[PDB]
């Protein structure tokens, strides 16, 4: 999470450190999302901040509509490739890393999400959950 967020994530395995580039699963016109910082993130000497499913990240768009580039913006993680472990006992993992552009309240800039979305993310951000395709 970070805030603007409804509910609470149980901890899930991190896979998207600073510098990770993930796919942009929305119709915003952005193709990349370059993670420059993670919202929750604590501090530890030389730990890269790393996001996981359904966290809010600060990101920049490396590829897409010119208007959408050379600036930082919140994004929300809807898919991660790093396998994580649900309390129901299953280690699952999506096939790529996707994120959706969002404002600080959590409201997507887009209106549609290509790809499936992990439920943990959907439960965190209703507005994400709205425009979502298949969830989990």
């Amino acid at each position: 999470s970070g805030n603007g967020a409804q509910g609470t994530k149980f901890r899930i395995s991190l896979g998207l450190p600073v510098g990770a580039i993930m796919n942009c699963a929305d119709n915003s016109g952005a193709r990349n999302l370059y993670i420059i910082a993670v919202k929750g993130s604590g501090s530890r000497l030389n730990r890269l901040p790393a996001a996981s499913l359904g966290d809010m990240v600060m990101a920049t768009v490396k590829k897409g509509k010119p208007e959408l580039r050379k600036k930082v913006m919140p994004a929300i993680v809807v898919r991660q490739a790093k396998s994580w472990r649900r309390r129901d006992g299953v280690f699952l993992y999506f096939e790529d890393n996707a994120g959706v552009i969002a404002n600080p309240k959590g409201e997507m800039k887009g209106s549609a999400i290509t790809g499936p979305v992990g439920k943990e993310c959907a439960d965190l951000w209703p507005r994400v959950a709205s425009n979502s395709g298949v969830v989990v």
Partner: protein, 52 residues
């Protein structure tokens, strides 16, 4: 509790076991272990794998 089935080896997947893969489209995949997972990532074929 539910037992699943390996979508490669046709094995029984009791809870906690193996891995769950959520492909591009949304087709969910299950492997009881790292072996049938590896064969799947290798693009082998259950129909030609004698123990499946």
């Amino acid at each position: 509790m539910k037992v699943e089935i390996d979508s490669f080896s046709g094995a029984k997947i009791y809870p906690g076991r193996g891995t769950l893969f959520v492909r591009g489209d949304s087709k969910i995949f299950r492997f009881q272990n790292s072996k049938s997972a590896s064969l799947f990532k290798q693009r082998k074929n259950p129909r030609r794998i004698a123990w499946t």
